[PDB]
Amino acid sequence: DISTLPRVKVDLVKPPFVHAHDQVAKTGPRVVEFTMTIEEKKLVIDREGTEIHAMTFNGSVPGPLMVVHENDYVELRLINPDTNTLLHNIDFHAATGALGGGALTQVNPGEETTLRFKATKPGVFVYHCAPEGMVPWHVTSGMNGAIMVLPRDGLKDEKGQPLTYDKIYYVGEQDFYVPKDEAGNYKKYETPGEAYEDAVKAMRTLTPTHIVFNGAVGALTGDHALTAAVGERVLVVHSQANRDTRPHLIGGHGDYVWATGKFRNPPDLDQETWLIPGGTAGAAFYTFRQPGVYAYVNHNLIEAFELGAAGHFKVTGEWNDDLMTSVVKPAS
Amino acid sequence: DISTLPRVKVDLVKPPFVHAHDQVAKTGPRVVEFTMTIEEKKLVIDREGTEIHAMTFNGSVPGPLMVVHENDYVELRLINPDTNTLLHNIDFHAATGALGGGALTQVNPGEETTLRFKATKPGVFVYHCAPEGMVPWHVTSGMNGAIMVLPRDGLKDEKGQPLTYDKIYYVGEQDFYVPKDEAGNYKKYETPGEAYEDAVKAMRTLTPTHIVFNGAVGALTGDHALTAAVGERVLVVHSQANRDTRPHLIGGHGDYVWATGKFRNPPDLDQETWLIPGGTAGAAFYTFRQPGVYAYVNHNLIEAFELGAAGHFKVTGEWNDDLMTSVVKPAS
Amino acid sequence: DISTLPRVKVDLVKPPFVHAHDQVAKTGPRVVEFTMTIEEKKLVIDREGTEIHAMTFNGSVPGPLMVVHENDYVELRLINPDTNTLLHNIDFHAATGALGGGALTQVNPGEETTLRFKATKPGVFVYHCAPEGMVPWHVTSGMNGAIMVLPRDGLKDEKGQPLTYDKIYYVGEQDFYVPKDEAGNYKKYETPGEAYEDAVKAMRTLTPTHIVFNGAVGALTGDHALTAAVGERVLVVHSQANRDTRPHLIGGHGDYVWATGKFRNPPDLDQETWLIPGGTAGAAFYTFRQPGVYAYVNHNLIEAFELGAAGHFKVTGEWNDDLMTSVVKPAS
């Protein structure tokens, strides 16, 4: 009887950060309430000033990570304000039935809806918009995110001992297919609707023009680099709603990796690089052992360094010469 | 001594259906006899009426699923009637030696041959045509299928308890590379041979023009949708002979997945999406919990919704509001 | 205290062969010393005489396999002679910190450097050049290889019993992106530097013009085919520094496969085809059961047979009719 269950309202935060939560559940099952507002907005995605009409959950690409526990109920109030122009909905890969909620959440501009589903399977899962007949257009315009459903007793290693993370980040990787004129310059449009048929042609090439973390080339760099300290245990959740990716931490590893993101399976150990299939979220756990700059990339290095799929960690602490040292610095 | 073993003749059925078989073996090892006839035929693959010269085992794309048990012998009579124009053969990934039977099964039009091999490894495996110097052309013209080699005691879960399916379907996913003129219209040819050099150029782009389940855009929809009932246990065998795919059941999961299809390994649990590498067959087990329409797709959603890699299940039975419910229907 | 550890100098050999080593460690931890010389050289990559300016470790594509044990120290003297024109460095995916050694090994022509790192994780790992701002160009010009870090007690199967290989081969798979003029003919340049901007455009298509094993179309064929005998246990290490691949032994299997190459995980059994993500090394163990020619391919068969990703084994010994036999040879 759902009426006798506690409700808890969560306010979401912008990626790559994640809302506050407990790893090990401190309560019985709850109805966890979330609200998201759909925003269609102009987004500048590269250093050249290329602009697209992005379609977002809550103003960000990706949409925010939602965190619950196994056998909680998720109740999502989804709002499409009348400032938008398109019909939208939501499909949770975590949910069972009705096209993941897609059949039940069709909202025109000016409408809202509330969906509830039981989180029966633990893991990280993609969610994404999926309106009838324009599914890939919405998804590849940025309308996707992820939800993590923790087991009620937290994460476990391959022997079933606890794994406790100190920090968690969410990296959403996005393939864009910006239409091009005859010479190869990116086209500009006043509304999303204008772009529709050129978008379809661009997608059909199967060749993205940009592949980015957190909505833009260089988004997870500089002042916006992810941070950690030597000794910290970090969980990186990574999603790709449409296309395969292969994350790699340059200078590090994935100590424990759920590459297809489902926590009832044991993790793969000591990964250099792992494959997250399109339409999947994965998760990797690493303990930092050396300070400095690390690059986190899609290890198709063209996709990383030319198309944009690269971010940085900056890690503080003490250098360990046992692990690595320059014996003779570069010299004639 | 093979002469003292029982023989059993099996008549194959059209995909997505699968010939009758026992999961748990009710006999000792047998020689299982199959016959296939090669058909070169014109196939219409999309709603626009695009036509290719398909090369088929038994008239279908994919070829039919063959089902045996571990340590049976498979004896295949392969017929190439003199109405065809090309040399063909067969390579079973399930078999050991002679290029999977390819070296021993070269048949010109008007010839036949009988191959026998022992099924030593349990799993689902691709089979495909592979004639010297035109391997990808034959395969990507539809000349592939799969064979399932069940363990003699049926399938097991990750703890080794029995898994029994109530229904089984075979989804063959096919990448086509239809040649195009300068403007981008699909070309037409009178014979397969005419197309050869344009086919090679089309393949080399590595960009398929269509990606389809069961031989055509929309083949597993409408009257041809796959069916099940709430509570039923369904095994979907999925093959791709040439290119990677990432299946996903929209509104469902892969409860138990052998993504690379080999049953001595434990299955991955609770998958949202899984990667089947090109040249592989995989298998996914799901128990339906909600009625309605489900879409089964390649979750590169461009490949699904624009290029054709999407089918439907229609599931009958009772709606469970505990799992999912609309709390507030879409409204102003 | 590293000064009290034995040192051992290893001389590397050309791929596909691998330097001599012990599977089970016969000594305690050592400092293993290697030397590599960077060579920029003109390479002919196909039968048409297409030429590129390759960038190599030790003169080969791939660079040589290095073999150590878990918790050895690797000490690499890296030399960039003043006959080269570019700045180079090295990133080991096996190492921890400083961008895998990349931050510490930047050498202009005429410089050398010595790096030491501790091999803390067992597996096969990619190494590759990664200079600031031209990472994919160097990697996709051939500047990559792999290192294997054996567990001190050798390899184990999925039950933890020993697996001992009789032979080991290293297959490096390389994606090239040779620039093309308007009509589609490959361009030629006098220096590597000349090619830079055309290279970037070619890479951005994400479409390789060639995909080869060991540096050229047909390199592992004819007199250069890999060899084995029926009954032998063979380990094939396969790396791809930039793009996904899906190896398959035609006529065989991967009996034990570490597709993402990390030996603390149990192997997948009985694989037909397996996925090695870009930026990864994997390893497959097979025991030959039939003599003859086997083709080892990337099972995107366009990539294999049209673009070059195919090699051969030639296996000697006795034919086993129990496993496979022609019952009726091809006939009218």
Ligand SMILES: O=N[O-]
């Ligand atoms: O500015 N909204 O697409």
Ligand SMILES: O=N[O-]
């Ligand atoms: O747009 N909410 O009524």
Ligand SMILES: O=N[O-]
């Ligand atoms: O679906 N492309 O990885």
Ligand SMILES: O=N[O-]
């Ligand atoms: O194909 N996805 O990198």
Ligand SMILES: O=N[O-]
């Ligand atoms: O679901 N992969 O851990």
Ligand SMILES: O=N[O-]
């Ligand atoms: O009509 N046969 O290709």
Ligand SMILES: O=N[O-]
């Ligand atoms: O074509 N059969 O003899």
Ligand SMILES: O=N[O-]
């Ligand atoms: O081989 N293409 O997935």
Ligand SMILES: O=N[O-]
């Ligand atoms: O690359 N296959 O979707």
Ligand SMILES: O=N[O-]
């Ligand atoms: O072979 N994969 O279960």
Ligand SMILES: O=N[O-]
């Ligand atoms: O000939 N050296 O690029």
Ligand SMILES: O=N[O-]
């Ligand atoms: O190039 N070595 O000094």
Ligand SMILES: O=N[O-]
């Ligand atoms: O990154 N391409 O497989």
Ligand SMILES: O=N[O-]
């Ligand atoms: O996408 N690599 O075959």
Ligand SMILES: O=N[O-]
């Ligand atoms: O790391 N894969 O065995």
Ligand SMILES: [Cu+2]
């Ligand atoms: Cu939308």
